[PDB]
Amino acid sequence: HMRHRTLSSSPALWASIPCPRSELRLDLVLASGQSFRWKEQSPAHWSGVLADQVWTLTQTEDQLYCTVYRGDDSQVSRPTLEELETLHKYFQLDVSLAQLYSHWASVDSHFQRVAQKFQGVRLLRQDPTECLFSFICSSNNNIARITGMVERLCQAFGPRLIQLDDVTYHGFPNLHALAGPEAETHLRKLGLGYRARYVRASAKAILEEQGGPAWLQQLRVAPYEEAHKALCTLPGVGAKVADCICLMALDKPQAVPVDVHVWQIAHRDYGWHPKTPSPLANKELGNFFRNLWGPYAGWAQAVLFSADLRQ
Ligand SMILES: Nc1nc(NC2CCCCC2)c2c[nH]nc2n1
Numbered sequence: 347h348m349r350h351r352t353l354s355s356s357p358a359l360w361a362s363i364p365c366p367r368s369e370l371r372l373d374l375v376l377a378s379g380q381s382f383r384w385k386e387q388s389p390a391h392w393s394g395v396l397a398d399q400v401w402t403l404t405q406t407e408d409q410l411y412c413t414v415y416r417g418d419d420s421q422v423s424r425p426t427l428e429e430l431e432t433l434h435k436y437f438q439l440d441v442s443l444a445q446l447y448s449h450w451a452s453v454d455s456h457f458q459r460v461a462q463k464f465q466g467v468r469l470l471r472q473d474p475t476e477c478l479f480s481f482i483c484s485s486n487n488n489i490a491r492i493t494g495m496v497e498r499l500c501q502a503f504g505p506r507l508i509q510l511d512d513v514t515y516h517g518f519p520n521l522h523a524l525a526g527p528e529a530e531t532h533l534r535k536l537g538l539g540y541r542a543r544y545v546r547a548s549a550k551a552i553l554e555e556q557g558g559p560a561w562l563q564q565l566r567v568a569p570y571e572e573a574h575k576a577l578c579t580l581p582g583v584g585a586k587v588a589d590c591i592c593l594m595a596l597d598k599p600q601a602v603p604v605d606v607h608v609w610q611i612a613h614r615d616y617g618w619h620p621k622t623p624s625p626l627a628n629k630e631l632g633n634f635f636r637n638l639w640g641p642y643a644g645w646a647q648a649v650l651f652s653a654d655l656r657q
């Protein structure tokens with residue numbers, strides 16, 4: 347009944363945003379461990395759900411093309427002005443990435459070389475809730491298995507939006523849906539394992555202890571270090587997961603999430619060793635990168651991480 351659109355098939359329902367290739371590369375961003383909700387269903391066409399709506403994104407050299415699926419048995423059309431603002435904010439396109447690239451490049455010869463090939467790696471501005479529970483699922487895991495866990499979780503707990511081909515799209519569940527007495531048992535059936543406990547517990551915690559999703563909005567305006575400590579009170583959320591959320595959902599560009607993977611890069615590519623792995627050592631490494639790259643150190647880190655995935 348409903349199929350995945352392409353730019354050739356139905357170009358009437360698309361709309362463009364002026365966006366250079368050097369500012370954004372969909373294929374280096376959408377499935378590079380930031381969001382787990384985007385899939386290249388057809389070549390160069392990334393479909394995914396964003397704010398209880400489905401999008402398909404494709405780009406050229408200088409233009410970013412996008413179409414929307416409402417899915418309320420209503421008359422189809424192009425993306426509105428407000429829907430384009432949502433996508434503008436999502437990619438944080440007011441921030442020049444070219445100027446940031448050159449800024450980092452001036453004080454880092456290693457970044458200079460990697461920045462040659464891998465342009466247009468930027469940070470998405472995600473919903474806190476979606477980001478929070480996605481990154482709780484990330485512990486001792488990989489992008490492939492995380493993507494599945496998040497998809498199944500949304501199917502079980504989140505509301506249906508639309509079906510395109512054989513892909514049924516669900517929005518991300520609210521906290522109440524994940525806090526229920528059966529939630530852990532269901533999530534274990536879906537294969538999350540121990541992460542099922544942390545998911546339910548954290549949803550339940552934000553509700554009762556922190557007073558619902560407004561708390562996450564408060565953290566978004568709170569200073570980085572205050573937001574980080576508050577997140578670390580949640581079950582299954584430590585320094586690494588907290589930094590991810592800070593960087594990707596709470597607008598803390600200086601947040602540098604450190605795990606064994608970042609240790610590996612830091613050591614191999616910068617020859618870094620702790621002067622003063624461990625919680626203490628991980629914190630020093632985050633300070634190191636902030637000292638080196640400055641207040642958008644988290645954005646620079648994404649370029650390396652994204653570059654490190656692609657051989
Ligand atoms: N799944 C996943 N994702 C990560 N995020 C990176 C890409 C986006 C910017 C921050 C780093 C991870 C970092 N360490 N382990 C990660 N796992």
Ligand code: NI
Pocket residue numbers: 613617619
């Ligand atoms: Ni060494």
